[PDB]
Design a protein around this ligand. Structure first.
Ligand SMILES: *CCC(=O)N1CCOc2ncccc21
Ligand SMILES: *CCC(=O)N1CCOc2ncccc21
Length: 346
């Protein structure tokens, strides 16, 4: 079997001519030539940690990506694993090869207003489908937006995704959170578990700001500093928006802060399109109840060139987890991964 940079990467005979792209969360990522479809593909290796112990996030992502079918969401083309549970160790996930991602592109390239507009449209078009399935992505950020050589955009990494659960969103002040810090909505630090669609719109707003300047808008260095970056631009929340926060420790923290002035969007982004800044303002609203929803964002004047709801498909049914994937013994999780990946065996 074939080897890459000292590590077993055993995907052949179908996939040959491996080139090391980089690392991921559970293993190496490579490109390879697919000898059946006669194109290069991307392949990620997933290895279990310690003793036959996989991660629930691998199962979560496989289940979602196999159910979803959308032009702006990465698909799974193939899954390679041993024919039996006893022999199963590494799992390889084959997907469309994409030239780059928005993190890489923003480190190196100024975006035209036309590119920012088109990228934003495609993010929201994919997000419309995700939210129509009652799913939250929960970790939208530039590195999770793949781009091909013609700037077609696909959302990836559904490892933190969850079914929406607004009735169970409330939590105490300073509740620990898993998703990438710079893209966390203010309410995560105050009173929210990130179980509502508004969590993802905030992340999109952060991405839009980052596309306008090539710099993250709210680069917090630690958990509470993320909130202070947010307030340093939006300014102090209004009395009405504070009254929405019933939790006293969260409320009183905000009341303890000095008054902070709003930084006008046109001063932060002096080169930006005025319609882009009006939409940014609506995505980066402090109060999640006042925050624009995905379908409203699509209908905003900034996206008028692209908006076409008949060409913005939705999911056939809401997505549901059959098992609660945090409850699971490690043997049951391996079994479920084996079963979810069965359709790719010959
Ligand atoms: C979300 C990241 C992802 O799924 N990756 C990692 C980068 O390379 C890559 N190429 C093709 C498809 C998916 C990915
Ligand atoms: C906490 C109350 C709240 O969020 N409100 C009050 C009225 O204004 C408003 N507009 C839209 C969404 C939610 C609210």
């Amino acid at each position: 079997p074939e080897m890459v940079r000292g590590q077993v990467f055993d995907v052949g005979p179908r996939y040959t001519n491996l080139s090391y792209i980089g690392e991921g969360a559970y293993g190496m990522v490579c490109s390879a030539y697919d000898n059946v479809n006669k194109v290069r593909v991307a392949i990620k290796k997933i290895s279990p940690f310690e003793h036959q112990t996989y991660c629930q996030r691998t199962l979560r992502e496989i289940k979602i990506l196999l159910r979803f079918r959308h032009e702006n969401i990465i698909g799974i083309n193939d899954i390679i694993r041993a024919p039996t549970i006893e022999q199963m160790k590494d799992v390889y996930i084959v997907q469309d090869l994409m030239e780059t991602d928005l993190y890489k592109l923003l480190k190196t390239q100024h975006l035209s207003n036309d590119h920012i507009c088109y990228f934003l449209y495609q993010i929201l078009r994919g997000l419309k489908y995700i939210h129509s399935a009652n799913v939250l992505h929960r970790d939208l950020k530039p590195s999770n937006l793949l781009l091909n050589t013609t700037c077609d955009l696909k959302i990836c990494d559904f490892g933190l995704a969850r079914v929406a659960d607004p009735d169970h969103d409330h939590t105490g002040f300073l509740t620990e959170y898993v998703a990438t810090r710079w893209y966390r909505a203010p309410e995560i630090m105050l009173n929210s578990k990130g179980y509502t669609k508004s969590i993802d719109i905030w992340s999109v707003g952060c991405i839009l700001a980052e596309m306008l300047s090539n710099r993250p808008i709210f680069p917090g260095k630690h958990y509470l500093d993320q909130l202070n970056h947010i307030l340093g631009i939006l300014g102090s929340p209004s009395q009405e928006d504070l009254n929405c926060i019933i939790n006293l420790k969260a409320r009183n923290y905000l009341l303890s802060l000095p008054h902070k002035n709003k930084v006008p969007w046109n001063r932060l982004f002096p080169n930006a399109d005025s319609k882009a800044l009006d939409l940014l303002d609506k995505m980066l609203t402090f109060n999640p109840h006042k925050r624009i929803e995905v379908e409203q964002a699509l209908a905003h004047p900034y996206l008028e060139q692209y908006y076409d709801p008949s060409d913005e498909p939705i999911a056939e049914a809401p997505f549901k987890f059959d098992m609660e994937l945090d409850d699971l013994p490690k043997e049951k999780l391996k079994e479920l991964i084996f079963e979810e990946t069965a359709r790719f065996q010959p």
